[PDB]
Design a protein around this motif. Structure first.
Motif: not given
Ligand SMILES: [Ca+2]
Ligand SMILES: [Ca+2]
Ligand SMILES: [Ca+2]
Ligand SMILES: [Ca+2]
Ligand SMILES: [Ca+2]
Ligand SMILES: [Ca+2]
Ligand SMILES: [Ca+2]
Ligand SMILES: [Fe+3]
Ligand SMILES: [Fe+3]
Lengths: 308, 310
Positions: B60-73
């Motif tokens: 999930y962390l790989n996908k989160l950063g690939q999507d550029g979404e850590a700040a959205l989470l």
């Protein structure tokens, strides 16, 4: 300030994890609530500033953009920790006598062709790596050889790179990766080249965090193994090349004393298909643990690369 | 289930991984990493989190950063709101709680928007489904005196819920619905724009995946973001919500505050002001800024932010 214990924060945590929601994935909500609560408490206790938090958020973006979350899991000891917990379960169950497990690492590639008894796995020339035979016998904890067991290995080239993960140019598919079914006497053999250790991608997220901690991101030379057989659990293990200066300073904490075999100098290499008469041999015998009531309580399913 | 956390082997591993016994380095960073790793290891031990579960989290962390979404989470699981809770508590203890309330920035600010004196028209692209909106107010200090030359910045979504520089359906004009105004000599600012609509997370992205796993929606009610700054004062991060939105009190990012839901007024005379219809809506949004304590702003936040050229 300290706000973690306030009703407003505890209500925020319950809402964020949806603890009061319709029937759903209770286990997932439990895990998320625990991790979020721990994070919020750590922020409160250490007075972690917004600037610090947003730098951590930005780091998570880079970590996933680099595809390195599993490399970080190794480098911060999480992967070893999983092995510690599995070892503790085996010890409590009274198991001994099997070859010790160690970490898989993030570089397995599924689909290597399976050969009977012997496999030559160096498909690409590598002038700086000398020839290496790895051979051994697979037994169970009762001492009996296991015929038809599947022994899989993978390792790096002289530049520290694995096939399917080489940034300087694609290797042949499954270079330095192979699988052998043991013969009737439990024997397997790989004809390969000697691995060298390697470091993390220098500009990547894992090395960035290690630099911030003051740590190196290097591993000593090693060969990875999966070993399986009817009636037995799947073993994830490795061995280390003896004499590597980093052998007890692996950034991923993977070395174990029973997994450092002796390296022998041999002749006769050309008749075995090696690129020189003089070569090195490592005898690595392997002992598998039997299943318990037909079940393997420790096999791990995780994302793994594949290739044709 | 085993319990290994409180063993020397594990505690030694944690000390090594965070390099607590290393040579002189970044002690603060090592302290944070050791705490987070220790808490993670203890949670794995307490909840008997299996290797399969851990590796799904790593994936999930790989996908989160690939999507550029850590700040959205960070917004969606309440972390961004939590930082505001802590800042509000510090302000209350310090007596710096007299200004307009703060709320979360969100991840969509873009630096570089054009600045105008007094009044700015920020709808650069037509949007047939959004009606005209005037936002105006006066900026004062906590003593009530107007602040001349203060910088009021705002940004908001179009009728499809998309912001310029983050629109997946096609590029907007740079800085569409983004502007900055220097207040006039009497503290006044005014924006002429179009009415925002709320929006959801990218449906295939990591944030919505986790929210779906929890059974939660990933939607926000309609709102307008602000930064307000000025010499001698702290920088305010705030927003207001559009009255009447059905999600106004069910924001997935927990940002709504009762003090930040202004009255919307119906007006006529829009064509004389350059708006596209006679009827329009006006929202008054006054701002009260807090003077700096000891000459330094100790709540301003530095985080990665997009930028662009007009
Ligand atoms: Ca025994
Ligand atoms: Ca070849
Ligand atoms: Ca090459
Ligand atoms: Ca705790
Ligand atoms: Ca227009
Ligand atoms: Ca539902
Ligand atoms: Ca005009
Ligand atoms: Fe490796
Ligand atoms: Fe927004």
């Amino acid at each position: 300030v300290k706000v973690f214990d306030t009703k407003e924060v505890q209500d925020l945590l319950k809402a964020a994890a949806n603890l009061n929601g319709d029937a759903g994935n209770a286990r997932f909500r439990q895990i998320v609530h625990r991790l979020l609560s721990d994070l919020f408490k750590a922020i409160d206790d250490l007075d972690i500033t917004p600037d610090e938090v947003w730098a951590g958020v930005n780091y998570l973006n880079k970590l996933g953009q680099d595809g390195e979350a599993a490399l970080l899991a190794a480098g911060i000891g999480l992967e070893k920790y999983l092995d510690i917990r599995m070892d503790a379960a085996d010890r409590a169950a009274g198991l001994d006598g099997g070859t010790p497990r160690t970490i898989e690492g993030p570089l397995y590639v599924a689909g290597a062709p399976v050969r009977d008894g012997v496999a030559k796995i160096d498909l690409d020339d590598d002038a700086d790596a000398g020839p290496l035979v790895i051979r051994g016998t697979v037994t169970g904890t009762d001492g009996k050889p296991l015929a038809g067991a599947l022994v899989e290995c993978w390792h790096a080239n002289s530049k520290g790179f694995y096939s399917h993960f080489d940034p300087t140019g694609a290797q042949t598919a499954f270079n330095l990766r192979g699988a052998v079914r043991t013969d009737a006497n439990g024997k397997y053999e790989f004809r390969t080249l000697m691995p060298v250790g390697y470091g993390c991608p220098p500009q990547g997220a894992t090395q960035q965090l290690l630099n911030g901690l003051g740590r190196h991101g290097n591993r000593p030379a090693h060969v990875h193994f999966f070993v399986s057989g009817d009636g037995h659990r799947k073993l994830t293990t490795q061995f280390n090349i003896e004499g590597d200066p980093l052998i007890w300073d692996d950034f991923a904490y993977a070395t174990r004393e029973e997994l450092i075999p002796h390296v022998v100098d041999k002749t006769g290499g050309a008749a075995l298909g090696m690129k020189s008469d003089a070569y090195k041999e490592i005898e690595f015998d392997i002992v598998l643990t039997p299943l318990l009531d037909g079940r393997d309580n420790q096999v791990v399913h995780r994302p793994r690369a594949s290739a044709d």
